[PDB]
Subunit: 55 residues, 3 copies
């Protein structure tokens, strides 16, 4: 009875684990977002290719 230790909750004290996974899936949301964006950009790429063939 002297040197006692409290409850060491490593899985609770953190609480960021759920955040890590969330943030991960978040970027994936943007990664795909850029993909869709990139698509519209494929349009402009063609818009200035043949679409502008008229002169």
């Amino acid at each position: 009875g002297s040197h006692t230790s409290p409850d060491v909750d490593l899985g609770d004290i953190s609480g960021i684990n759920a955040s890590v996974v969330n943030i991960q899936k978040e970027i994936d949301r943007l990664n795909e977002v850029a993909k869709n964006l990139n698509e519209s950009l494929i349009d402009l790429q063609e818009l200035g290719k043949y679409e502008q063939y008229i002169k």
Copy 2:
């Protein structure tokens, strides 16, 4: 005097909490970045709609 325990700093040993919030706000920075990007893409969408009406 035998089984002693050191200082268990759960809020210090981590040090990632500040990083989690930072990374979170970071994606938000990109999420909005895609939004602005998406805007320019709205342009190309119209560029090939009426803008190319000339033939």
Copy 3:
């Protein structure tokens, strides 16, 4: 012999440190992704500027 404490591994219990750095470099991957996207958008910006000068 009474109040004993187990092995408190703060650097092991976490295991998210490697994830934090990974996610960080991940966004950077998108940040640059938006940059390249933004580029194609510079095109559409010009596509509707002089490219459409024809009427």
